[PDB]
Amino acid sequence: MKVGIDAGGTLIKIVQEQDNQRTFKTELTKNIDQVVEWLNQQQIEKLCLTGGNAGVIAENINIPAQIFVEFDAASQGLGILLKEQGHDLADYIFANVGTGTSLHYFDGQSQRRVGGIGTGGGMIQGLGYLLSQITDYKQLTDMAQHGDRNTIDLKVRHIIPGDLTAANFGHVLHHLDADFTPSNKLAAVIGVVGEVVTTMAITVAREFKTENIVYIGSSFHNNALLRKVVEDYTVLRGCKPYYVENGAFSGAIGALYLEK
Amino acid sequence: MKVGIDAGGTLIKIVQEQDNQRTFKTELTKNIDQVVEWLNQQQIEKLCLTGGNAGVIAENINIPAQIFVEFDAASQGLGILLKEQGHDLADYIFANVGTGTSLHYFDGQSQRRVGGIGTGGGMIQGLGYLLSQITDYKQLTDMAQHGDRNTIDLKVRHIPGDLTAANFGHVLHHLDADFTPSNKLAAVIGVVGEVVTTMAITVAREFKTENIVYIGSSFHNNALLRKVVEDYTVLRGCKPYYVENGAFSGAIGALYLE
Ligand SMILES: Nc1ncnc2c1ncn2[C@@H]1O[C@H](COP(=O)(O)OP(=O)(O)NP(=O)(O)O)[C@@H](O)[C@H]1O
Numbered sequence A: 001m002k003v004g005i006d007a008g009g010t011l012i013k014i015v016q017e018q019d020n021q022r023t024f025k026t027e028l029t030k031n032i033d034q035v036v037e038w039l040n041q042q043q044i045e046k047l048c049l050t051g052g053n054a055g056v057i058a059e060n061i062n063i064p065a066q067i068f069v070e071f072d073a074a075s076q077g078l079g080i081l082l083k084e085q086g087h088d089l090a091d092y093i094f095a096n097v098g099t100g101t102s103l104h105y106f107d108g109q110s111q112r113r114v115g116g117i118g119t120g121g122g123m124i125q126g127l128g129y130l131l132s133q134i135t136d137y138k139q140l141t142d143m144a145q146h147g148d149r150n151t152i153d154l155k156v157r158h159i160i161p162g163d164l165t166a167a168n169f170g171h172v173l174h175h176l177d178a179d180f181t182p183s184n185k186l187a188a189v190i191g192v193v194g195e196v197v198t199t200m201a202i203t204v205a206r207e208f209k210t211e212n213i214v215y216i217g218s219s220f221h222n223n224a225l226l227r228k229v230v231e232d233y234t235v236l237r238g239c240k241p242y243y244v245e246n247g248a249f250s251g252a253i254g255a256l257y258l259e260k
Numbered sequence B: 001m002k003v004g005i006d007a008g009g010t011l012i013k014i015v016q017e018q019d020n021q022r023t024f025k026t027e028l029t030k031n032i033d034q035v036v037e038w039l040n041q042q043q044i045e046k047l048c049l050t051g052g053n054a055g056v057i058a059e060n061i062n063i064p065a066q067i068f069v070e071f072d073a074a075s076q077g078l079g080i081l082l083k084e085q086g087h088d089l090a091d092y093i094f095a096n097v098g099t100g101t102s103l104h105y106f107d108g109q110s111q112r113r114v115g116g117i118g119t120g121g122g123m124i125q126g127l128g129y130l131l132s133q134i135t136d137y138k139q140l141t142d143m144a145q146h147g148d149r150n151t152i153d154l155k156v157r158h159i160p161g162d163l164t165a166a167n168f169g170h171v172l173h174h175l176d177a178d179f180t181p182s183n184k185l186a187a188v189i190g191v192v193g194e195v196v197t198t199m200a201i202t203v204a205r206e207f208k209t210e211n212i213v214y215i216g217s218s219f220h221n222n223a224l225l226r227k228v229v230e231d232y233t234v235l236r237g238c239k240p241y242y243v244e245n246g247a248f249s250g251a252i253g254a255l256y257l258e
């Protein structure tokens, strides 16, 4: 088999390919040593790595490894997944919502980083923990799904489509009578992260004259709400959103594809 | 006397221009009736309004007032506040950090809105409350001035060093709980200031200008927020500009769009 790995600061994404069948696997970066042991007890044709922790895995294994720069790997992997899923875009902005968020413009041939921002999955987890004391990712995200943001966010609807948020968390001081439940607070956290990401995305989309915006990154994992927030807001701000199944593995898949 | 008022959704900013001496005053929008009561019992040579609640004031006062578009009023007033305070700029992006945040590109002639985001003073108050149960504004902002964001935010250094790789991204690695009300509130202010700067920085590049001016009542009694935006703006490659009384840009502008 062939193995493509994207070892990020939070999650390690692994793509195993064999007999024209690829398996996706995700492990926490805190358990990177476990990924190392797993690799050594495996017979591998080619190992391709990317991500900030590629080196940590490389210097502790017993076979050579081809390492690639993450932005180009992600870009290549994403292009492959898009085509496999029926999308044929001439150009687009792709936002990799990982620990933080990186924005890239793909002109149809190559990618270039055009922006980044501290709002992403790490904030969802971090701020999410501060507001609910929940550390388990699945528990955190599951809970957020059924939350109501109306008593927390101030929208145009309350005071440009009425669906636009005028101020995130700007309604709180108007509902001190309300029950700011864990579910509601988390939904608002996801709301602001999603909206900020989208607002940055549609801004660069306008700048680089593309109306297509592709969303990837593990932050969407087990979080339907985040995806809904971004897709909807993207439409509202006038661009076309595209979610990619297993898009979080764009880097791992791209790395494998780039092997020489 | 001449009076310029920017009646926003949260704060009513009032500027009084004597012969050539101006005084500033802020009141809560919830007490707009008091502002009207006040105005009627006043002798005003000229009253100019702007902001979403201008209409409420206009139809309840006993004298005819002129109402202006907030974007143009702010631009006009800001441009005056700059020229006065010595800033002569060929162009710039100005960020109005009010309840929410509005982004404008002034091309040297006029302004044009190029962006808007929900992160601003409303979030500071709302998320601030959810993290400290503090309702009083002065109290909330004061408490945040002395906080340390190091155990809360994940920085590039933790992995341009002082850049933030993930707001609140360090929280799970410091669950020891040195998450004092002050450190939390400071982190709330940090992400708001950074998101605003990032957006400003991006549209500044899109519209080819190295200048970014920051105004808004959100900066009131919050030196941390001003410091956050000014420092981050440097890191992203542009030059920041802060104007004293900049939150009164609209009020001032309304009196000068004559
Ligand atoms: N099992 C999981 N555990 C924790 N976080 C998860 C999990 N699944 C998804 N996530 C979320 O996904 C985010 C990580 O996204 P990801 O695209 O993997 O970034 P990364 O590669 O680790 N970081 P970077 O190196 O900065 O590119 C986390 O911050 C979570 O919000």
Ligand SMILES: Nc1ncnc2c1ncn2[C@@H]1O[C@H](COP(=O)(O)OP(=O)(O)NP(=O)(O)O)[C@@H](O)[C@H]1O
Residues within 6 Å of the ligand: B007, B008, B009, B010, B011, B012, B051, B052, B097, B098, B099, B100, B120, B121, B122, B123, B124, B125, B137, B216, B217, B218, B219, B220, B247
């Ligand atoms: N005394 C105060 N009380 C409440 N908020 C204050 C006060 N001083 C400053 N602020 C902050 O200032 C923000 C309001 O900024 P401001 O520029 O006045 O917006 P606005 O004009 O009311 N909004 P908009 O209707 O959207 O134009 C609040 O959300 C607070 O963060």
Ligand SMILES: [Mg+2]
Residues within 6 Å of the ligand: A008, A009, A051, A098, A099
């Ligand atoms: Mg990554």
Ligand SMILES: [Mg+2]
Residues within 6 Å of the ligand: B008, B009, B051, B098, B099
């Ligand atoms: Mg305002």
